[PDB]
Structures are given as structure tokens and as C-alpha cells.
Amino acid sequence: GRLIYTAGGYFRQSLSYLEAYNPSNGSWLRLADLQVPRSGLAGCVVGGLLYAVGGRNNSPDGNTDSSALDCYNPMTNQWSPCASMSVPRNRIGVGVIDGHIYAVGGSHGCIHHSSVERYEPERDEWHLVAPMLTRRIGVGVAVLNRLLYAVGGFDGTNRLNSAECYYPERNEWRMITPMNTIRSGAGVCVLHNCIYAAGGYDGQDQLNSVERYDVETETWTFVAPMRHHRSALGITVHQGKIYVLGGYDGHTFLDSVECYDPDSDTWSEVTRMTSGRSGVGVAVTMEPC
Numbered sequence: 001g002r003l004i005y006t007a008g009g010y011f012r013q014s015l016s017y018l019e020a021y022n023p024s025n026g027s028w029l030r031l032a033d034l035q036v037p038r039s040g041l042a043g044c045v046v047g048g049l050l051y052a053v054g055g056r057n058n059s060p061d062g063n064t065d066s067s068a069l070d071c072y073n074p075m076t077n078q079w080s081p082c083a084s085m086s087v088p089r090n091r092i093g094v095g096v097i098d099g100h101i102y103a104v105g106g107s108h109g110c111i112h113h114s115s116v117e118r119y120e121p122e123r124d125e126w127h128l129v130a131p132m133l134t135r136r137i138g139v140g141v142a143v144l145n146r147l148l149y150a151v152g153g154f155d156g157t158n159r160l161n162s163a164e165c166y167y168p169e170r171n172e173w174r175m176i177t178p179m180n181t182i183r184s185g186a187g188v189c190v191l192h193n194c195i196y197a198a199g200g201y202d203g204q205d206q207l208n209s210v211e212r213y214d215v216e217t218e219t220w221t222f223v224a225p226m227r228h229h230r231s232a233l234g235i236t237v238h239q240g241k242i243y244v245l246g247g248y249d250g251h252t253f254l255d256s257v258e259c260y261d262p263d264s265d266t267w268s269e270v271t272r273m274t275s276g277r278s279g280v281g282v283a284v285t286m287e288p289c
Ligand SMILES: O=C(O)C[C@@H](c1ccc(Cl)cc1)c1cc[nH]c(=O)c1
Pocket: 040, 041, 091, 137, 138, 139, 153, 154, 159, 184, 185, 186, 200, 201, 203, 206, 231, 232, 233, 248, 278, 279, 280
């Protein structure tokens, strides 16, 4: 069976936790800590391995943006460092295409990146690709039909409803239809033929609204809202359902986990994380041993 892995996050300071939730039985396991605390990171999986990408260590003894890529092997319960990115990227988004990891946007101090780079596991090497048309931190990233999408974020001045698509064989970005809502630090994922954007921050409020982009019609449509307003949430897909983990609602660092059933267009509470946190990295792979 497969588990939902949550890595890092923020509560009072950046966190090192790696914990795994099993939808099939409701259990949480605490696994090997990250070597360096980090919030604002992203998670992804390639070849059954879990990767933690970017972020920032907000700590008593200083604040350090991360260029790190680290690899967790469920078979061994060990973290291993990989090649670092060209630049530190806090509040990063990532997507996987054809076994390669794309790192998108994020911040380094007051620098808000439009740059994008691609990691090749078989070479342990990062290479820059074409930059996005827009600087985006707190950017949502998803992959559909071997195309990469960057959705919302913050450009250093404004939070964004805009979104864009990267065509690998052209090494080019093009704008798509903007969302109906400004969202920085939404959760963005794919399910069936649609890109979903859940929650986020519009500069005033954390959001409970959820909308989805149909690549065939090029239009965004709202679906049922989440039960909890949240920005800086983690999101993933497990067996055809969207799960959202944690985040911030302007009052509380949430422990709430919700899942979305697209067939009934309903959100339900599923479990609580062991402690409230925002800015986690989340992905799905095999249980450890
Ligand atoms: O829009 C912003 O400036 C960044 C945004 C954010 C924070 C964490 C992450 Cl991981 C992703 C996005 C944010 C800021 C303040 N309050 C928010 O609720 C949300």
C-alpha cells in the first residue's frame, strides 16, 4: 500500500519531521527526520524515492533559504543529500515529467525567482531551463499530459491569479487562462484532465475556495469549498482523491487533513496531523520496511 508522506513545515520554527499517513487504516508513522529543518519546501516522488526540494530554515539561530535536494528511501528509512540547485528557493513548487524534477520559482531573500531548473536523477545534475514569464513564490505546480503548469503565487509586489504552461519540446512558457481567484500558497495538483487550485492567500484572507482548470475547455470552474480556510497547505493525490494537509488560516497552524471526492463534489475531514504546521512538502509512495 501507499502512504502520504509529509516532510518539514513550520510551527514557531522550521521543522524536521517526516511522518507518513496510511489512508487504508488511519495510522501515522514518524520516520527519519530531515537532516536540516525546512519550511516552504516541496515534495515529489521519482522511482519510488521521496525528494524534498528547496525551502528555508527559519530557526532561533538564523534564517537560511535552501537550495538543497534530499532523497528519502522508504526501503532504508534514510535521507541522502543530492546535488543542490543553482539558487536557494523558499516557497518553491515542483513537478515531475519523464523522471525529471522541475524546480519552479521561490524566493532567496528579497529575490523572487522566475527561473526554473530541471534535475536528472540518473546524472545527479541540475540544469536551468527557460524562465517563467512571471516571478512566482508560493507557486502551485502540476503536470498534466507531459506539460508543466505554474499557478498563482506572489511576484514580490502582488499576489497572482495568473497561470502559465511550459512546453518541454519548445523550452517555452506561455500564459494560460487566469484563475478566477488570486491565490498565493494554494495547493495545486492534477486529477483526471483538470488542474485543481485549493485555498491560498489573496493578500487579505486565507481562502477555502477551490477551482479547477479543464485543459480541453481552457476554463476555470469552482467546485465545493474546503471545510477550512488555508494557505501554505500541502496537497497530493492518493487513489483518485485529493488530500490537503495543514496550512495557516490567519489564526491557527492547522493540523486538519481533508479529502475531496470528485464524484460527490464533497470534502470530508479524514485525520489530524500529529501537530499543526504550514509549508510542508507532501508526496505519495510505498510504505517503508
Ligand atoms: O503571498 C505571500 O506573500 C506568501 C504566502 C505563502 C506563505 C507560505 C507558503 Cl509555503 C506559500 C505562500 C503567504 C504569506 C502570508 N500569509 C499567508 O497566508 C500566505
